[PDB]
Symmetry: C3
């Protein structure tokens, strides 16, 4: 009897699809769902097996309608803090993972739902996608990184527009301001997201992971410090065997085959 929506996980070798199966509450994130998401992120980040994950919502109405407001109604202040820590840890673990995370936005992504999308590396929007950080219309602020991650993508003026008005934008508006990387044709969201995952997986595993981390770890650094950080990562990747395979494959006019070492 308890309301216990959960994730479906579809494994496709180096790529997995995780679907929020919670349509009765528009794929809102409950306490137990967030615990499960964090656990799944930890486990994929301990494999080298899985190199890309697509996260999507079941159905055509909602990617994720935010935190579950029915459950939230009577949560005590410390319980709210614990939930926000779960968002923080989980979203940071997505960023720290060697795996690349793609949000396949199939419908409304509101509040925490947009925050989940912002934590991912890449975003694909279906025609029904709608994004918004609606928190101020609920009496709160974005507490899952939205006040920070949105401005990193769109700048403070557009971030203030969205966050202070709480208005919702459609897929193409999101694309045009740099919030969605791809616009999927109607009916083709998962095919587009999977193809995006394939385009990442064909590249060398450590190079993809290291480049991802170089980008995020440069956040907030002054240029000299950022360049020194990139150089440290570049020197590390020089020692991988895949780096040598890239040079050998080029010298031999053939495709490289990378092993993730």
């Amino acid at each position: 009897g308890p309301h216990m929506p959960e994730f479906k996980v579809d494994a496709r070798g180096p790529i997995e699809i995780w679907t929020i199966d919670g349509e009765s509450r528009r794929n809102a994130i409950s306490r137990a769902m967030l615990k499960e998401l964090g656990e799944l992120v930890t486990r994929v980040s301990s494999s080298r097996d899985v190199r890309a994950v697509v996260i999507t919502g079941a159905g055509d109405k909602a990617f994720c309608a935010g935190a579950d407001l029915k459950e939230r109604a009577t949560m005590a202040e410390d319980e709210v803090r614990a939930f926000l820590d779960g968002l923080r840890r989980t979203f940071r673990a997505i960023e720290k993972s060697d795996c690349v995370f793609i949000a396949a936005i199939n419908g409304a992504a509101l509040g925490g739902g947009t925050e989940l999308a912002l934590a991912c590396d890449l975003r694909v929007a279906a025609p029904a996608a709608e994004l918004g950080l609606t928190e101020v219309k609920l009496g709160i602020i974005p507490g899952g990184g939205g006040t920070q991650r949105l401005a990193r993508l769109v700048g403070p003026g557009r971030a203030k527009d969205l966050i202070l008005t709480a208005r919702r934008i459609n897929a193409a508006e999101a694309f045009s301001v740099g919030l969605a990387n791809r616009l999927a044709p109607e009916g083709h969201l998962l095919a587009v997201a999977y193809g995006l995952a394939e385009s990442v997986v064909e590249n060398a595993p450590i190079a993809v992971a290291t480049a991802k981390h170089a980008i995020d770890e440069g956040t907030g650094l002054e240029l000299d410090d950022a360049l020194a950080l990139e150089l440290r990562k570049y020197e590390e990747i020089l020692k991988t065997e895949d780096r040598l395979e890239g040079l050998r494959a080029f010298a031999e006019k053939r495709a490289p085959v990378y092993k993730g070492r």
Copy 2:
């Protein structure tokens, strides 16, 4: 006469730079009065949004007053720049949300004033520009910092190093202007934008503004910790509970600012 006209409407006010004969320039007197206005609205949560515009249809603000500047010794220039910095930072630190309604040319310090505001609305024939290098100076009211943070460093270098004008279509396309207004409707649009913000919960709007700005230049973990500290400002509010009750009752919330 006062440097500004003030049209107070309770939680929203409209301030009009009343300086048409100098194209609404930032004289020392204008800057002092602007600071007094910002201080007043920042002293309580009763005024939640302010629209700033220029009188007339020629200029929002033509920048620092260059006739006054000709009379100023170097230490006076430094003092003016310090007061400009303080006033623009006071706009950012204020809980009140500031909307620049750009009714005409916004040049140099005038674009810097617009950039210090939270949101910008432009009339169809309005133009912006940081023209300082064409005057032998650089932006000294934050333009070299706020513009890049807004439109990216390449676009900022274009505008600042060429000193060119940017029109309304370009400004809207790149997000320098958040809204455009039909002719004769600039204030109606800017006031409507203010009303849209004021519909939302008072403490949450102010806290969210500050979370966005205070995250500038932070590394990610520090920025996320900052946001969680800011969330504490709304966690113990009655308005947070009203949001949840309104959702439960399938009705619109009505916030009280506590």
Copy 3:
């Protein structure tokens, strides 16, 4: 042999045009090309005359393909490390120079060629312009600051798209995201880039250089620190004759005549 130089240098008073004269080799950064490039940057930085430089590649296929991998395979280990270090130093010198650098992107830019474009202050894209940082296809990451320079220009979402998927960005998208400041019509690349340079050099010489550095040095600073930096930079123009001339010209309703002092 006559020792054809790696660059053609067209001196036009306050502006120079540098054409990489390597069309048959995709305008690659060979050791010789890098050597000349670094010395050209030093020369224009010390030249009073030269205040802006347009860099372009010969032909319509390549702006600059990056390192010449055929040459690379012949280089000893110390020579490779010296090349990479010299490349990094040259990009930093472009950034620190008072001279304003405009990349006129006439074709494909890859690797170090894209990094060169990113080190410039402004970019103009011909219709054939295409830019990539596709290193993850080779088992490596950018080695000349490309990850950070790209992310600082276009943000982390767009940088992750380009670098993690190893896809190129073409002219219209480059313009939309602020990577290309101008789109040139077919056949008019250099006219557009030269006109952009002319529009910069109309302005006061010290002010232009100081403003360039104020913009660049502020990224990564918290706001109050960034504003303090701008006021320190203002000191560089406060005691100049050109500042007084701007005020006098305004008072006298005439055009200013700047002198770079």
